[PDB]
Design a protein around this ligand. Structure first.
Ligand code: HEM
Ligand SMILES: [Zn+2]
Ligand SMILES: [Zn+2]
Ligand SMILES: [Zn+2]
Ligand SMILES: [Zn+2]
Ligand SMILES: [Zn+2]
Ligand SMILES: [Zn+2]
Length: 129
């Protein structure tokens, strides 16, 4: 769809994930089941977003330099890109489950995994400007 709005939506989605990731890191080093649960609820809403519509062809950093960090490589590795997003969803579920179960150790560990899923995709698909 309209590059402007799709770029806006795409940026909103990832910024919210980044905020969520920051909040959860703070929670992990001084775990509290109540705080963990409010963060997991927020994450749960974010992951309910379908990102497919957010990456239409013609919106990479090559097409719109400076306007986005989405690498052209994404559109030639859609299956891989999709599998990496799926890994994030699965890791997110482990974090949420640990928050709901009030298990701090499981939360801390699930958090490491979630963080790894962000890096796995960023390493190949995000501009390291
Ligand atoms: C893991 C939960 C995760 C985090 C955290 C995260 C954050 C993040 C931010 C903050 C941005 C910057 C947004 C901005 O413009 O200000 C960003 C950008 C991209 N990401 Fe990411 N991201 C997380 C996970 C993943 C996963 C699993 C994927 C790929 C399957 C992914 C991809 C990207 C891409 C591409 C961008 C650039 C987007 C753009 O500039 O339009 N991220 N991410
Ligand atoms: Zn941005
Ligand atoms: Zn408490
Ligand atoms: Zn208490
Ligand atoms: Zn997703
Ligand atoms: Zn999911
Ligand atoms: Zn990263």
């Amino acid at each position: 769809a309209d590059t402007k709005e799709v770029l806006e939506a795409r940026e909103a989605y990832f910024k919210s994930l980044g905020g969520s990731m920051k909040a959860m890191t703070g929670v992990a080093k001084a775990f509290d089941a109540e705080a963990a649960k409010v963060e997991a609820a927020k994450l749960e809403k974010i992951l309910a977003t379908d990102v497919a519509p957010l990456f239409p062809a013609g919106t990479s950093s090559t097409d719109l330099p400076g306007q986005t960090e989405a690498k052209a490589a994404i559109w030639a590795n859609m299956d891989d890109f999709g599998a990496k997003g799926k890994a994030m969803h699965d890791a997110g579920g482990a974090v949420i489950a640990a928050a709901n179960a009030g298990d701090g150790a499981a939360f801390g560990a699930a958090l490491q995994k979630l963080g790894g899923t962000c890096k796995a995709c960023h390493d190949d698909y995000r501009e390291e400007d």
